[PDB]
């Protein structure tokens, strides 16, 4: 089992479309009813859903937000009735310090909800977090929740889908501070999926609805095998151990109109495609640390071995000199059309990601020398006296970059 | 006629599919409880270092197929499989200071690669062929042979019958590194052993009979 | 297996009608479907096509062009859906230097496409190139691709169907430069089929649609035996070794209206006809270097031996004094009507081809003495400083003529 903590407008939407994808996959009706064709289903549902006496299924989700508008719109959707009104929380009434201050203020009810959800699962495995690191809501609230959660639950995993601000595009003027602080908290508490609007929209090209549909696709494909038990990799901890910051790529990212080219898609061509920098959805002979490829559809392990052999000989990849990939196979949901003969998802750890922080650090250093937009931060208690928090966070990020 | 009335009506084939399923999901929760003993404690857990003899009940119409000496072989592969799930899960549940992590990936890989070999390349290759064979059963006798030609071959690919103290013990002794390193949570004296036994493993398996090369890459 | 690289308007069309001929021969539907009568076919299809999970077959073709119009028209044809939209490439936005500069600029995506296509074939044998040497697009782009391909793939054949500019007709005012440079690159990198509009249209007489239909006929008849496995000559390398610049001729170049004269056509008369300069589709006791005659239809090797004996005695041909032909037989596709009892195609290497370059050299020398139309070339980086490239190319062509 698992819980999802989605914050800010970004996280709220991310959750909306993630649950849309999930209910589509598992044959869950918008109202929580189960379709007749899926009555005898074999798919495991406990992982993301828990059924109710009324036979309906409820997501293990909690909605958090500093503002009402987004969730109010969500509850006007056809999927509104599905969620649990008890879990959803809205502030009665764009800065990280303010977000963390509110988090300190509203500890009690949030952790009440979290405890209630936790006690309903026998074998909870970890946590899932969806949020954006730039905006005031996501950054600060996620920081506070991560801190108090790692404190509260020292034996549960914490996984996040953190969305990083666009850089080529000059959105949050105060983004460097929030990003740097959120990164501090991620290193200091997060167990383990980086995301950026820049490269994501780049691949989308070459509305937020479609972008986050792709993101939800990534999340669902990541959790597929856990959802669909097989032989190997039957747990999230198995995933994490096989890799341990990450980046992702998915081959069949094709529009509903781009099915006309039914290209004979082997496993070799897919696994190859997952390697190119173009497909890496995120934007010094930098090299890899780990690679995992989850493959959906018919697959012959002989083909997998041949592809691995050929790629190894062709040396299209580079590895650490000081240490000695993985190809897991799953089964598609029996419901969604198998427009793709075989499909592939890749999650990897690669040193080049360091550059991200070097940019943000460069951004942050490009402001701290002139004290820009610190007036609001001084208002909050945390930065009321000084900003030693900022210095510690910057040095922590520098240490991480040095370690990479 | 006999095979026809044996698909249902004392469905011997249906019983056989369940057999290789309740071991080789469900059995994930079962073993995880054993990680954290008593002989009755396990039963309620099941109904929910090398022991745990497992058996089953077979009706007379299928007793002739799944013989008594057939239970032990099915039990043999189950014991060894768990020790792999053990080491794989023991090094997975957790999450010169950081130098230990380099000993993790250098090891969490190796046990993971082996597990990918026994289950997928063997416990699923011959399994996919066996089902395609039994569905064409046309005889009382040959159904025994196609079945007996499934264990005595899966006990050979999975190296457990012979060459144990020559090859199998190497994988067994390095499995003790998965136990020792798991508890501690001397460090330099581990890689001197690890880089030796692992090289001992490849410099011994290098004699490759031919199907061993599917793992010889690492 | 094989790949086709067609550039410029000439190459784009050439490819269109070549694939039209191929799909006609192999019973491939315009949409890529296979006809019912051809379900049990014995013809080998992997050579030029690869099938898809949807049962449709996709050509191993890539479309390149500096301009969109031609390919846009192609995609409005009934054959549009057949091609692979992924492989097709169009420049988002008439000189050789500009073409090569763009080639330097768009290296990455082109070679991405080429690698993707290459990795889908187990036993790729060589490359096929179709282009015109005069126009800016074909000349420069083919030059760049040949250079970077011979660099990238040092173990694959490179075959071209190069179209030469008309000379009796005064089309590209700057043709001498492009032709000379393309010839430099062809000598320096090309493994092995000269083509000219002048003699081609001469034989056509005595629209581009019909001209290129004839050209595609030549290409298909050249590749027949490879497509249709037999006993001998079961590989392109076998072809090349048996000959090694070339010229071609085809006997049954008859209109759809000129079938009324069903002339009793032996093998002797055909193979004889392939020798005359009239049938050589291209325009010092110059002599031959090599001759190959591929014969389609019923054939008795006794007839072939008799024809060879008689032609040898009649000494209608001349050979090199310093060195010691070949007649291969194939089988017609079982589908297209056998309006011809027996048909013949000839590919030969003959010294007279030297004259071509002597003309172009004479053309080029007729301009370099007065510096005509060099203003545009100086614009590009390659000819920004000097034109030593031109001098080296001219001397290389002179060396080739001397060698002949």
Q: How far B3 CA lies from chain A's nearest CA (Å)?
A: 29
What part of B 73-92 touches A (C-beta under 8 Å)?
Answer: 88-89, 91-92
Is C136 among the annotated ligand-binding positions? yes
Asked whether C292 and C242 are in contact (CB, 8 A), the reply is: yes
A323: nearest CB among B29, B93, B102: B102
**Alpha helix (H) ranges present in A262-329?**
267-273, 301-314
Coil, strand, or helix at residue C164?
strand
Which residues does residue A326 pair with via DSSP β-bridges, in sequence order? A292
The C-alpha atoms of residue C225 and residue C178 are separated, in whole angstroms, by: 34
Which chain B residues have a beta carbon less than 8 Å from that of A324? 105-106, 109-110, 218
Interchain pair A324, B105: CB under 8 A: yes
CB burial class (10 A; 0-12, 13-18, 19+) of residue A88? Answer: middle
Asked whether B12 and B6 are in contact (CB, 8 A), the reply is: yes
Q: B215 CB near a chain A CB, below 8 Å?
A: no
Residue C186: C-alpha distances to residues A28, C150, C403 (Å): 63, 11, 16
Residue A212 structure tokens: 């986050």
Q: A265 CB near a chain C CB, below 8 Å?
A: yes
A262: nearest CB among C50, C54, C120: C54
Closest Cα to residue C111, out of C187, C5, C192, C1?
C5
**How many angstroms from the chain centroid is the CA of residue C245?**
11
Asked whether B106 and B194 are in contact (CB, 8 A), the reply is: yes
The C-alpha atoms of residue C385 and residue C379 are separated, in whole angstroms, by: 10
Q: Which residue of A has its CA nearest to B109?
A: A242
The secondary structure element, H or E, covering residue B99 is helix B99-116
Q: How far C2 CA lies from chain A's nearest CA (Å)?
A: 17
Interchain pair A263, C52: CB under 8 A: yes
DSSP class of A352: G
Interchain pair A263, C86: CB under 8 A: yes
Q: Which residue of A has its CA nearest to B211?
A: A302
Q: How far C390 CA lies from chain A's nearest CA (Å)?
A: 37
The C-alpha atoms of residue A368 and residue A184 are separated, in whole angstroms, by: 17
Residue C108 structure tokens: 């990455």
Q: C44 CB near a chain A CB, below 8 Å?
A: no
The C-alpha atoms of residue B176 and residue B111 are separated, in whole angstroms, by: 12
Which residues does residue C161 pair with via DSSP β-bridges, in sequence order? C130
The C-alpha atoms of residue C202 and residue C193 are separated, in whole angstroms, by: 18
B120: nearest CB among A157, A301, A322: A301
Cα A75-A79-A81 angle, rounded to 5 deg: 65
Breaks (C-N over 2.5 A) in chain A follow: 93, 170, 192, 206, 244, 283, 324
Q: How far B102 CA lies from chain A's nearest CA (Å)?
A: 7
Q: Which residue of C has its CA nearest to A267?
A: C120
The C-alpha atoms of residue C401 and residue C10 are separated, in whole angstroms, by: 27
- In the block, residue with structure tokens 């509903």: A256
**How many angstroms from the chain centroid is the CA of residue B110?**
16
**How many angstroms from the chain centroid is the CA of residue A278?**
20
Q: A268 CB near a chain C CB, below 8 Å?
A: yes
Chain A interface mutation, best of B93, B110, B201, highest count of A Cβ atoms under 10 Å: B93
The C-alpha atoms of residue C110 and residue B98 are separated, in whole angstroms, by: 44
Q: Which residue of A has its CA nearest to B123?
A: A231
**Chains B/A: 3 or more C-beta pairs closer than 8 A?**
yes
Q: A266 CB near a chain C CB, below 8 Å?
A: yes
Q: A385 CB near a chain B CB, below 8 Å?
A: no
Which chain C residues have a beta carbon less than 8 Å from that of A272? 119
Closest Cα to residue C238, out of C162, C294, C287?
C294
Please report all neighbours of A, defined by 3+ CB atom pairs within 8 A: B, C
Is A136 among the annotated ligand-binding positions? yes
**Chains B/C: 3 or more C-beta pairs closer than 8 A?**
no
Q: B102 CB near a chain A CB, below 8 Å?
A: yes
Interchain pair B98, A241: CB under 8 A: no
C53: nearest CB among A262, A268, A269: A262
Buried b (16+ CB within 10 A) or exposed e, C59-72: bbbbbbbbeeebbe
Residue ranges with strand state E in A118-192: 126-132, 157-164
Interchain pair B91, A290: CB under 8 A: no
Chain C interface mutation, best of A255, A264, A313, highest count of C Cβ atoms under 10 Å: A264
Which residues does residue A159 pair with via DSSP β-bridges, in sequence order? A128
CB burial class (10 A; 0-12, 13-18, 19+) of residue B155? Answer: middle
Q: B123 CB near a chain A CB, below 8 Å?
A: yes
The C-alpha atoms of residue C170 and residue C94 are separated, in whole angstroms, by: 17
DSSP letters spanning A209-238: HHHHHHHHHHHHHHHHHHHS--SS--SHHH
Q: A322 CB near a chain B CB, below 8 Å?
A: yes
Please report all neighbours of C, defined by 3+ CB atom pairs within 8 A: A
Interchain pair A229, B28: CB under 8 A: yes
Coil, strand, or helix at residue B102?
helix
The C-alpha atoms of residue B156 and residue B137 are separated, in whole angstroms, by: 24
- Deposited resolution, Å: 8.5
Interchain pair B25, A235: CB under 8 A: no
H and E: helices and strands count for chain C? 14, 11
DSSP letters spanning C78-106: TTGGGS-TTT--------HHHHHHHHHHT
Interchain pair A238, B89: CB under 8 A: yes
HSE on the CB side for C336, CA within 13 Å? Answer: 18
Q: A348 CB near a chain B CB, below 8 Å?
A: no
Cα B201-B205-B210 angle, rounded to 5 deg: 150
Q: How far C211 CA lies from chain A's nearest CA (Å)?
A: 31
Q: C53 CB near a chain A CB, below 8 Å?
A: yes
Which residues does residue A343 pair with via DSSP β-bridges, in sequence order? A296
**For C299, left (φ over 0), alpha (ψ -120 to 50), or beta?**
beta
Interchain pair B95, A231: CB under 8 A: no
Asked whether A47 and A228 are in contact (CB, 8 A), the reply is: no
Q: Rg of chain B over CA atoms, in angstroms?
A: 20
């Amino acid at each position: 089992e698992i819980i999802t903590l989605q914050l800010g407008q970004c996280g709220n939407q991310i959750g909306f479309e993630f649950w849309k994808q999930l209910c589509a996959e598992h044959g869950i009706s918008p109202e929580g009813i189960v379709e007749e064709f899926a009555t005898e289903g074999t798919d495991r549902k406990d992982v993301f859903f828990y059924q109710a006496d009324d036979e309906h299924y409820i997501p293990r989700a909690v909605l958090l937000d500093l503002e009402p508008r987004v969730i109010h719109s969500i509850l006007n959707s056809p999927y509104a009735k599905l969620y649990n009104p008890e879990n959803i929380y809205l502030s009665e009434h764009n800065n990280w310090a303010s977000g963390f201050s509110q988090g300190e203020k509203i500890h009690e009810d949030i952790f009440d909800i979290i405890d209630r959800e936790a006690d309903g699962s026998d074998s909870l495995e970890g946590f899932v977090l969806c949020h954006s690191i730039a905006g005031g809501t996501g950054s600060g609230l996620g920081s506070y929740l991560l801190e108090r959660l790692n404190d509260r639950y020292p034996k549960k995993l914490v996984q996040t889908y953190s969305v990083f601000p666009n850089q080529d595009e000059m959105d949050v003027v105060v983004q460097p501070y929030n990003s740097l602080l959120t990164l501090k908290r991620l290193t200091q508490n997060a167990d383990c999926v980086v995301l950026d609007n820049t490269a994501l929209n780049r691949i989308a090209t070459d509305s937020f609805s479609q972008i986050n549909q792709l993101v939800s696709t990534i999340m669902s494909a990541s959790t597929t095998t856990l959802r669909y038990p097989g032989y190997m990799n039957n747990d999230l901890i198995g995933l994490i151990a096989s890799l341990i910051f990450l980046m992702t790529g998915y081959t069949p990212l094709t529009t509903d109109q781009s099915v006309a080219s039914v290209r004979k898609t082997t496993v070799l061509d897919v696994m190859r495609r997952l390697l190119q920098p173009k497909n890496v959805m995120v934007s010094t002979n930098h090299c890899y640390i780990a690679i995992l490829n989850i493959i959906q559809g018919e697959v012959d392990p002989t083909q997998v071995h041949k592809s691995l052999q050929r790629i190894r000989e062709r040396k299209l990849a580079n590895f650490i000199p000081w240490g000695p990939i993985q190809v897991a196979l799953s089964r598609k949901s029996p419901y969604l059309p198998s427009a793709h003969r075989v499909s592939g998802l890749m999650m990897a750890n690669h040193t080049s990601i360091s550059s991200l922080f070097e940019r943000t650090c460069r951004q942050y250093d490009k402001l701290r020398k002139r004290e820009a937009f610190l007036e609001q931060f001084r208002k909050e208690d945390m930065f009321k006296d000084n900003f030693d928090e900022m210095d510690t966070s910057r040095e922590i990020v520098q240490q991480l970059i040095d370690e990479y | 006629n006999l095979m026809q009335t044996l698909k249902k009506d004392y469905r011997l084939v249906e019983y056989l599919q369940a057999m290789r399923n309740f071991f080789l999901d469900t059995m994930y929760d079962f073993y995880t409880s054993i990680f954290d003993q008593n002989v009755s404690f396990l039963n309620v857990q099941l109904q929910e270092l090398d022991g745990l003899t497992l058996s089953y009940k077979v009706p007379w119409p299928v007793d002739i197929v799944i013989s008594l000496e057939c239970q032990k072989i099915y039990n043999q592969v189950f014991l060894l499989l768990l020790q792999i799930k053990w080491a794989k899960y023991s090094l997975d549940v957790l999450l010169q200071i950081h130098r230990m992590f380099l000993l993790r990936v250098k090891l969490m890989h190796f046990v993971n690669s082996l597990h990918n070999y026994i289950m997928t390349r063997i416990l699923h290759s011959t399994g996919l062929e066996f089902q395609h064979q039994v569905e064409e059963a046309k005889d009382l006798d040959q159904l025994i042979k196609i079945h007996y030609r499934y264990l005595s071959t899966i006990h050979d690919r999975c190296l457990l019958r012979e060459k144990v103290s020559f090859v199998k013990e190497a994988i067994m002794k390095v499995l003790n590194l998965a136990l020792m390193f798991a508890d501690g949570w001397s460090i330099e004296k581990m890689e001197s052993d690890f880089k030796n036994c692992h090289m001992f493993l490849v410099t011994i398996l290098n004699k490759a009979f031919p199907h061993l090369e599917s793992l010889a890459l690492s």
